[PDB]
Amino acid sequence: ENQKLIANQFNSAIGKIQDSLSSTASALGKLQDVVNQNAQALNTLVKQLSSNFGAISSVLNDILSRLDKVE
Amino acid sequence: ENQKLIANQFNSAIGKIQDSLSSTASALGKLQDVVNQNAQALNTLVKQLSSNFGAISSVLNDILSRLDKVE
Amino acid sequence: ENQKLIANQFNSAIGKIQDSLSSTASALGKLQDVVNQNAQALNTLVKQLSSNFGAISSVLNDILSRLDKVE
Amino acid sequence: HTSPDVDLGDISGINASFVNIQKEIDRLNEVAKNLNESLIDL
Amino acid sequence: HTSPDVDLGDISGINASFVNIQKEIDRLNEVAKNLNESLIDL
Amino acid sequence: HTSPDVDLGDISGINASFVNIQKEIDRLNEVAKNLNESLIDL
């Protein structure tokens, strides 16, 4: 009787811990996905910003050359 | 006697696992908060950068028009 | 006999839960490290972008002054 | 004489996803509370 | 004749928070170590 | 008369790390599956 109680409580606890482990795995997977997506977003933003600043640098350099020619 | 030992060890283990589950939930909540805040920060930065590059584009376009008028 | 079965199953479950807790701690540590590194990256990017936009602002202001002097 | 326009690379497409693991945090807290119903009282 | 100044939108306010869950990782490792004190030795 | 070049601060060094905790997620799911082998059947 006490052994049946111990076994039933243990099986209940193991089921609840299995649920908790599946929930933790799901949450960690979602966090990994979102963190990696935002890392890729930051890298893409840095690349596009480097390109845009290169373009801005070139255009202002041409403009400074034109101003030098004028004055 | 052995049943009391089994029950005591099981209750101790269940208490420790409850502590671990609360700690995991707290850590996952903090990670979610920080990840969402940095995502919002990246989005705000992208919006402000789009605005700033629009302004830069307009100003350099006006400047190129002025240079064209001069030369 | 049943007590030995209960104790063996409980020890097996506690070992597996110890493995799961170590895995969760490792994953949370890695997530913390990566999230903090990307936060530092976003902050460094914001600082460098503020500097670059200050430089761009100064250069276009000088250029607008030159255009004003010309015309 | 003319002046070519300057079109900067549009970056508005860069979007940062959000995470929603509140179901899992709620389930973890719920299990940490329900495990009190699994304690043995001989 | 004049020239209007160009004031770009200041973005220095955009700050990225940091996470500190080291207490929780330490507690998880501590419990994974202390669970050896809950093993049954009949 | 001359014109000093304008060199903007290079930001290409700013890189965002990636996280790989797939081993740990796989281990968590594996343990959540293997805990069925620890159930007591008197």
Numbering used by the authors:
A (entry chain C), B (entry chain B), C (entry chain A): 918 to 988
D (entry chain E), E (entry chain D), F (entry chain F): 1159 to 1200
Could you share sentences copied from the article?
In each case, the process of viral membrane fusion is mediated by the trimeric viral spike glycoprotein (S) that is cleaved into S1 and S2 subunits by multiple host proteases upon infection. Two heptad repeat regions, HR1 and HR2, distant from each other in the prefusion S, drive membrane fusion by assembly into a six-helix bundle. This HR1HR2 bundle formation is thought to provide the energy for membrane fusion and is therefore a target for therapeutics, as exemplified by peptide inhibitors that disrupt infection by the HIV-1 (19, 20), SARS-CoV, MERS-CoV, SARS-CoV-2 (23–25), human parainfluenza virus 3 (26), and respiratory syncytial virus. We therefore designed a scaffold to efficiently determine structures of the postfusion HR1HR2 bundle and its mutants to near-atomic resolution by single-particle cryo-EM.
The V1176F mutation, similar to the wild type, remains solvent-exposed but slightly displaces Q957 on HR1 and also decreases fusion activity. We observed various effects on neighboring residues for the D936Y, S940F, V1176F, A942S, and the Omicron triple mutant. These structural effects correlate with changes in fusion activities for these mutants —the D936Y and S940F mutations result in a loss of a salt bridge along with a decrease in fusion activity, the V1176F mutation on HR2 slightly displaces Q957 on HR1 along with a decrease in fusion activity, and the A942S mutation introduces an additional hydrogen bond along with an increase in fusion activity. The fusion activities of the D936Y, L938F, and V1176F mutations are ∼60% of that of wild type, while the fusion activity of the S940F mutant is ∼25% of that of wild type. We determined single-particle cryo-EM structures of the five selected single mutants and the Omicron triple mutant of HR1HR2 using the same molecular scaffold (NpDps4) and data processing workflow as for the EM structure of the wild-type HR1HR2 bundle. Overall, none of the five single and the Omicron triple mutations dramatically altered the architecture of the HR1HR2 bundle, as indicated by the small RMSDs between the wild-type and the mutant structures.
